């Protein structure tokens, strides 16, 4: 069974993007959906939608890359260079508002799940709350 | 180790083993000579290294090097040791402090005088 | 009983007392119950004596007995003045 569905999703995307796929599917879950809304809203992914693959609910995530490049290896740059789980079963990580980190001086983001819902580190900071440091992205 | 493991066993702090059981890890230790033989070095060396077996006040019996051109330690003189290996003589881990007790300081030494315990010579 | 006395806080030949409320039994420089002023005998600065009459009066009203030098100073700051 999947031991950590969020870690899984983050990875499917890590994997899919590294071989430049058009998109990738991930088992559907409300929580995962709230996280995708961030990724989309922040411009890491074109967006995502709810498809039903072989009778079961999935979320097609449409990935996003840069332009083709010059020289040896014309592979596009990644939009999502990095994306790593922070809190995980076995080692849950919670932060207070004064402890929310600053991913790459702001050039990146940290998705945390608060009692006010899933928020980026800037969002959560404004709202003035903290919670579980879900992941990190840049 | 998984986090749970570290929770269960934690990490282990290693221990520093003394390289000079000059007991009570004092800075120096007083002793009395019992032997004052010579010893042959090892590796790519050769010479008659001067050494002394000292019956220490710390209830220890150890060999100490006798640094300097020439010495005057007899098979019964009181001396002080500081601890310092002699890379060439395995087993020798302490040095005898020249200039303290029955250990005369090196005579006619002008350079590193402070070590070898030798007073500043006069001049005019 | 509890006292209002001076606790020594300067440095050698540089005395700076700290007017405190403490139990009679403590070291003169030990743990006090409250600081209610300070006093520089040598008057090295214009501000060589502060007191806080308000507080000095609260303790006096509940038992605190000042030493002779303590009251001399408390008075100089009008702790007992009732005019």
């Amino acid at each position: 069974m999947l031991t950590d569905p969020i870690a899984d999703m983050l990875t499917r995307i890590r994997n899919a993007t590294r071989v430049y796929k058009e998109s990738t599917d991930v088992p559907a879950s409300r929580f995962k959906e709230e996280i995708l809304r961030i990724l989309a809203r922040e411009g890491f992914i074109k967006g995502y939608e709810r498809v039903d693959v072989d009778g079961k609910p999935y979320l097609r995530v449409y990935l996003k890359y840069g332009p083709r490049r010059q020289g040896p290896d014309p592979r596009p740059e990644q939009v999502i260079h990095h994306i790593r789980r922070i809190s995980k079963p076995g080692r849950r990580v919670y932060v207070g508002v004064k402890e929310i980190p600053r991913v790459r001086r702001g050039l990146g983001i940290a998705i945390l799940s608060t009692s006010k819902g899933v928020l980026t580190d800037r969002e959560a900071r404004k709202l003035g709350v903290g919670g579980e440091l879900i992941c990190e992205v840049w | 180790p998984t986090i749970n493991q570290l929770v269960r066993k934690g990490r282990e702090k290693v221990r520093k083993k003394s390289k000079v059981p000059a007991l009570k890890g004092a800075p120096f230790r007083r002793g009395v000579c019992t032997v004052v033989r010579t010893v042959t070095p090892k590796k790519p060396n050769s010479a008659l290294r001067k050494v002394a077996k000292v019956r220490l006040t710390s209830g220890y019996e150890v060999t100490a090097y006798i640094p300097g051109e020439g010495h005057n330690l007899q098979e019964h003189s009181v001396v002080l040791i500081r601890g310092g290996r002699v890379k060439d003589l395995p087993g020798v881990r302490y040095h005898i402090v020249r200039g303290v007790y029955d250990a005369a300081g090196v005579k006619d030494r002008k350079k590193s005088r402070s070590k070898y315990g030798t007073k500043k010579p006069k001049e005019a | 009983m509890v006292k209002i006395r001076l606790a020594r806080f300067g440095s050698k030949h540089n005395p700076h007392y700290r007017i405190v409320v403490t139990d009679a039994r403590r070291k003169r420089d030990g743990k006090y119950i409250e600081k209610i002023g300070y006093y520089d005998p040598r008057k090295t600065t214009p501000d060589w004596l502060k007191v806080d009459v308000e507080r000095a009066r609260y303790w006096l009203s509940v038992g605190a007995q000042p030493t002779d030098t303590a009251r001399r100073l408390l008075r100089q700051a009008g702790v007992f003045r009732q005019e």
């Binding site: 076995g90 080692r91 849950r92 990580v93 919670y94 | 986090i3 749970n4 929770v7 934690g10 | -």
Partner: protein, 104 residues
């Protein structure tokens, strides 16, 4: 305020006294993961009103004996040996881990 704790009654084999197994959770001081640690309190029961499986609140009290500095406040919910079971098995499991053999 007198500390109030909630736990399960594991022992009953005592006169006017019951053992309450109280658990607590907290982040590991160094490794972060939330860990569960437990403790048994001998609580006072003048009327022998509570039994095994009773989840009761315990309140900080004036000493009743050595070991007994807690009294059973109220019942939170009863019957539930699933909790007593963990304790019992975990107790019996002690047969295997030792020097002498044991069908643990």
């Amino acid at each position: 305020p007198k500390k109030v704790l909630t736990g399960v009654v594991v022992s009953d084999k005592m006169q006017k006294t019951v053992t309450v197994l109280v658990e607590r959770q907290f982040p590991h001081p160094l490794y972060g993961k939330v860990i569960k640690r437990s403790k048994k309190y001998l609580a006072h029961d003048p009327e022998e009103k509570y039994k095994l499986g009773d989840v009761v609140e315990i309140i900080e009290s004036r000493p009743i004996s050595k070991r007994k500095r807690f009294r059973v406040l109220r019942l939170v919910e009863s019957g539930r040996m699933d909790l007593v079971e963990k304790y019992l098995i975990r107790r019996q499991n002690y047969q295997s881990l030792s020097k002498r053999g044991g069908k643990a």
